[PDB]
């Protein structure tokens, strides 16, 4: 063992490994610990940095996967399983990985930190989809990816208590941000070019980061793929968080510190086993433990912050996949199945609305049906099916996206929006689901670039272009090539014209107003109705 995969980092030396990309060698440093193992009486507490080690730290592979729940809804089904952890589960899981081209350039390079999604109850950078291998070799970028604590462990909170402050899951990732701001340079990583991007719950964290100053200053640009800090699922009141924790605590078998005390004596398996029960109303796309408004990390609700923060100095990329809400219908919305067209009746569509929009009381539910029913064809199963998926996508992702984008463009931030409309030729889900939640990552990362992987030429040339967009943004802010460019230039989402493009095998096609009408309902009306009921 002795090439140039040896690096001194502020805490010791590490030996990486040379991974071969389809286009050549890559320098991967998998496994770098960045915090003291949060086990024993350090669970539920904020991360603490990694004390320096002696000698050379092996870094030839991926570490643990933060203890979590494994979705086993579809045994053996690629679509579902491709998201399951691929390493042993352990609380001793906080480690970040780094990727650099072979050999690491003398010239400082833009850094891309990727935060995994997983509805705040799952996820791991260890996953194949998140393979920085290509984005580094081909584009010549330096990628990074931490493992934040998720679930009970990552977000249980008894606000106003030093034992379980909550939001610690976010704190871990913040730490990884710092480790970069004081180490990435040693990989030829430009400590300025940091561009943190994310999907779903991860994408929500990014947003969560540009809202808390302490975090803010650790990165420069930001990307949000299908998720927002301001949605109805990524935040909970200091009171509700405090409600679930206590409930779980009682469920298990357990005076704040005392409550926590007992919790720390309780088995990870035990805790995981019981997290899906603190959920109040039957619903979908509604997770039990997510960031809480502690009035410390998030001083006030994401909405207020978004509503007033200065953003003129921030470049942002925000987007949505065509069919967002489809994915979650199979988790308990009557009629739906991945094993059939899922042709629903107006009978079931009614229950569908009750579940999907679970916080809305009767009258509001009426407001939803009105808006989504086609009165000239109120019982057409097809329309009803699609409309059902539509209520979930809009309610959770698209509309809140359009909103963040709106409020952000006003406060001077450079915003670019898009809607990825390409269904991969390798999807496993039925045709009726369209381009589901998370099925773009496959491309953003460059997976199609690996000739062993099955895909299509079009898709390959496609993935390449997408890669360019991301990197270009990370390298400058404008996701467009210079004079040498596919002339259909990507227009910055301006509040007034509301333009944005479409990502698919065909060239950039601009459009105006992202769901203008439906969102006006959701973002504008619905709230008021809710306050009134």
């Amino acid at each position: 063992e002795d090439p140039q995969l040896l690096v001194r980092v502020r805490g010791g030396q590490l030996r990486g490994i040379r991974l071969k990309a389809p286009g050549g060698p890559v320098s991967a440093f998998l496994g770098i610990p960045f915090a003291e193992p949060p086990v024993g009486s350090r669970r539920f507490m904020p991360p603490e940095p990694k004390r320096p080690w002696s000698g050379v730290l092996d870094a030839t592979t991926f570490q643990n996967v933060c203890y979590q729940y494994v979705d086993t809804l579809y045994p053996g089904f690629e679509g579902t399983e491709m998201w399951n952890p691929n390493r042993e589960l352990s609380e001793d899981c906080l480690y970040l990985n780094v990727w650099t081209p072979y050999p690491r350039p003398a010239s400082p390079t833009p850094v891309l930190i990727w935060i995994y999604g997983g509805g705040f109850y799952s996820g791991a950078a260890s996953l194949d989809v998140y393979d920085g291998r290509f984005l580094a070799q081909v584009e010549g970028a330096v990628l990074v990816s931490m493992n934040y604590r998720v679930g009970t462990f990552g977000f249980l909170a008894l606000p106003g208590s030093r034992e379980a402050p909550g939001n610690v899951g976010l704190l871990d990732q913040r730490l990884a941000l710092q480790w970069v701001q004081e180490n990435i340079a040693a990989f030829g990583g430009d400590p300025m070019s940091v561009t943190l991007f994310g999907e779903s719950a991860g994408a929500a964290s990014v947003g969560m980061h540009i809202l808390s100053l302490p975090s803010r200053s650790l990165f420069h640009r930001a990307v949000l793929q299908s998720g927002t800090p301001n949605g109805p699922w990524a935040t909970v009141s200091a009171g509700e968080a405090r409600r679930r924790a206590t409930l779980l605590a009682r469920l298990v078998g357990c005076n704040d510190t005392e409550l926590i005390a007992c919790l720390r004596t309780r088995p990870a398996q035990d805790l995981v086993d019981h997290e899906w029960h603190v959920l109040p109303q039957e619903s979908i796309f509604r997770f039990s433990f997510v960031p809480v408004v502690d009035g410390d990390f998030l001083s006030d609700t994401p909405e207020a912050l978004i509503n007033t923060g200065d953003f003129q100095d921030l470049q942002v990329l925000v987007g949505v996949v065509k069919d967002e809400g489809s994915y979650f219908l199979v988790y308990g919305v009557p009629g739906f199945s991945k094993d059939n067209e899922s042709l629903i009746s107006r009978a079931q569509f009614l229950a569908g609305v009750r579940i999907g929009v679970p916080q809305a009381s009767d009258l509001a539910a009426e407001a939803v049906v009105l808006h989504y029913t086609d009165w000239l064809h109120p019982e057409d199963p097809t329309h009803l099916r699609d409309a059902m998926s539509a209520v979930v996508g809009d309610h959770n992702v698209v509309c809140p996206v359009a909103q963040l984008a709106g409020r952000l463009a006003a406060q001077g931030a450079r915003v670019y929006a898009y809607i990825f409309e390409h269904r991969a030729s390798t999807l496993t889900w039925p045709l009726w689901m369209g381009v589901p939640h998370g099925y773009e990552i496959e491309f953003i990362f460059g997976l199609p670039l690996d000739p062993s992987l099955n895909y299509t030429t079009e898709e390959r040339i496609f993935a390449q272009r997408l890669m360019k967009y991301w990197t270009n943004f990370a390298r400058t802010g404008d996701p467009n090539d210079p004079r040498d460019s596919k002339s259909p230039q990507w227009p910055p989402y301006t509040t007034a014209a509301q333009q944005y493009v479409s990502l698919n095998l065909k060239p950039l096609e601009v459009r105006r107003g992202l769901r203008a009408q439906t969102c006006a309902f959701w973002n504008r009306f619905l709230p008021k109705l809710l306050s009134a009921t």
């Binding site: 086993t72 899906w276 029960h277």
Partner: protein, 61 residues
Amino acid sequence: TMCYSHTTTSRAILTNCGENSCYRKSRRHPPKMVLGRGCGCPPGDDNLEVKCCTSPDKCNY
């Protein structure tokens, strides 16, 4: 009989349950999350449905 086995933290393994019934423990109300499958047929509660089958293989899907 071949069935699937797993906790809330395990992958779906296939374990020969011999001549016995095998289950599927899932959440009763949406989201109807699967909380594990195994051999035997245990009593559930209002919090979780437990479907039990006997034939054929993978019937506790």
